[PDB]
């Protein structure tokens, strides 16, 4: 029974070390994915707002040519 317990201890040590590596790897994967999509969302909104300025700037130039 003492030999089975010695085995169980060394397996627990290996398993906890492996679980720590695993969670570090998952937590880091979800952080970097979350950051990428957040940053792309912020630049998309920046340029989609700058493109609304281009639509408005052509409405101003076409409104001029509707005073002819």
């Amino acid at each position: 029974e003492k030999r089975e317990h010695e085995r169980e201890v060394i397996q627990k040590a290996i398993e906890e070390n492996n679980n720590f590596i695993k969670m570090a790897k998952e937590k880091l994967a979800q952080k970097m994915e979350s950051n990428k999509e957040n940053r792309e969302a912020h630049l998309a909104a920046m340029l989609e707002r700058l493109q609304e300025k281009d639509k408005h700037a052509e409405e101003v130039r076409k409104n001029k040519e509707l005073k002819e």
């Binding site: 070390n17 570090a24 880091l28 979350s34 957040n38 940053r39 912020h42």
Partner: protein, 440 residues
């Protein structure tokens, strides 16, 4: 064997890096070209200095070190400086555009473009090791690379190296030399992210080193060069255990056992003595009792806090030079008799001691006197929490208004990471309070 790989991240880490290696070369009799005349085993060996230096067949002794910065200026000075021959070019890694004092750019935006390259070069050093002990990480809390890139690196090292030991030397920010209003944000973010990944971290308060330079070395307005030479001595005393051998040398891992009662309580306070000018050290022999007693004066600490208003959970004393056991035993017995040091009730009142006989060295044209003997005390005291408290307060002041947060949100971070990081620091401050309460 028991090799250590040193990693120097960002300006602070790199420049403290230069001072440390320069100092190690002078201590081991290694020249700026890497040749070491006193070493008769050419090509390799397992002498104590081989924990920090590998060896080429050509007789060159090469630091087991990677230097990383997201910006080429500081490392370019290493690449063309006095010690350029010491390092292989692959050990000196640089990007183009820095992290702009933003944790988010160091960890996510800019940092991710160079992280796989850095692990590659670290792996090349690891594959040269017969029995890798672990890593020493040098970095600022305040900078964007020092905070953000170091965090990323630490997370990745835990994945790629399991539980190999990882020690930090972390530069804690001071108003006298700071270059960023957001340093408190970066300090809290990196401390939170790194806490689970670091086995032992030595904080170096720049304000403390600044004061020691002013007060003890008569330096008017200290520069990084001044600060760094003194930091190097303290780092040298801590690593001395690994780099030398001797009958009374206690290894850094043994001090670690006494210093870390619980995994999160891994921030030892370092105190160093004597820090004295050549002019004052003339016709003045400072005894073992004198320098030991100087470890309990808070003016000589690496972090500004007061251990006399806290409780010790460990006390380790790392002597170097002309020091013999009789003198050390007598000095520590005086500390006991006089008291002035309360331990928590759950901790034995021990003083774990080591001695290396090689005396302290100084760099040419430095401020420090060459003394016969020196000591670095490493203590675990509840008072170190004061450093977190000061920083956590500055964090709160700005974060209640969300001041500067848009710079972090703009690089992909959420407010959730800030408040999560601050909760972990609140929990850390409570841990240092809890361990200091007496048992029922």
């Amino acid at each position: 064997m028991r090799e250590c790989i040193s990693i120097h991240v960002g300006q602070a880490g790199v420049q403290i890096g230069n001072a440390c290696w320069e100092l190690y070369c002078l201590e081991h009799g290694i020249q700026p070209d890497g040749q070491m005349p006193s070493d008769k085993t050419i090509g390799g060996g397992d002498d104590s200095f081989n924990t920090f230096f590998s060896e080429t067949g050509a007789g060159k002794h090469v630091p087991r070190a990677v230097f990383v910065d997201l910006e080429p200026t500081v490392i370019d000075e290493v690449r063309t400086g006095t010690y350029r021959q010491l390092f292989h070019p692959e050990q000196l890694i640089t990007g183009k555009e820095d992290a702009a004092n933003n944790y988010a750019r160091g960890h996510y935006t800019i940092g991710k473009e160079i992280i796989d390259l850095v692990l590659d070069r670290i792996r090349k050093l690891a594959d040269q090791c017969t029995g890798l002990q672990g890593f020493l990480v040098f970095h600022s809390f305040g900078g964007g690379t020092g905070s953000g890139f170091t965090s990323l690196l630490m997370e990745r090292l835990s994945v790629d190296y399991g539980k190999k030991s990882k020690l930090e030397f972390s530069i804690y920010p001071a108003p006298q030399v700071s270059t960023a209003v957001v340093e408190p944000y970066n300090s809290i973010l990196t401390t939170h992210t790194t806490l689970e990944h670091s086995d032992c971290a030595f904080m170096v308060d720049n304000e403390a080193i600044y004061d020691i330079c002013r007060r003890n070395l008569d330096i008017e307005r200290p520069t990084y060069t001044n600060l760094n030479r003194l930091i190097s001595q303290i780092v040298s005393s801590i690593t001395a255990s690994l780099r030398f051998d001797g009958a009374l040398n206690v290894d850094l891992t043994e001090f670690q056992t006494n210093l870390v009662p619980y995994p999160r309580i891994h921030f030892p306070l370092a105190t160093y003595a004597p820090v004295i000018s050549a002019e004052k050290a003339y016709h003045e022999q400072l005894s073992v009792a004198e320098i030991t007693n100087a470890c309990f004066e808070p003016a000589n600490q690496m972090v500004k806090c007061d251990p006399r208003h806290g409780k010790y959970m460990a006390c380790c004393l790392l002597y170097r030079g002309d020091v013999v056991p009789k003198d050390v035993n007598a000095a520590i017995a005086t500390i006991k008799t006089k008291r002035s040091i309360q331990f928590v009730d759950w901790c034995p009142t021990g003083f774990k001691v080591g001695i290396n006989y090689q005396p302290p060295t100084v760099v040419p044209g430095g401020d420090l006197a060459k003394v016969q003997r020196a000591v670095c005390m490493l203590s675990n005291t509840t008072a170190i929490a004061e450093a977190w408290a000061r920083l956590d307060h500055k964090f709160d002041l700005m974060y209640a208004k969300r001041a500067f947060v848009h710079w972090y949100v703009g690089e992909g971070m959420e407010e959730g990471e800030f408040s999560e990081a601050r909760e972990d620091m609140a929990a850390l401050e409570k841990d240092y309070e809890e361990v200091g309460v007496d048992s029922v």
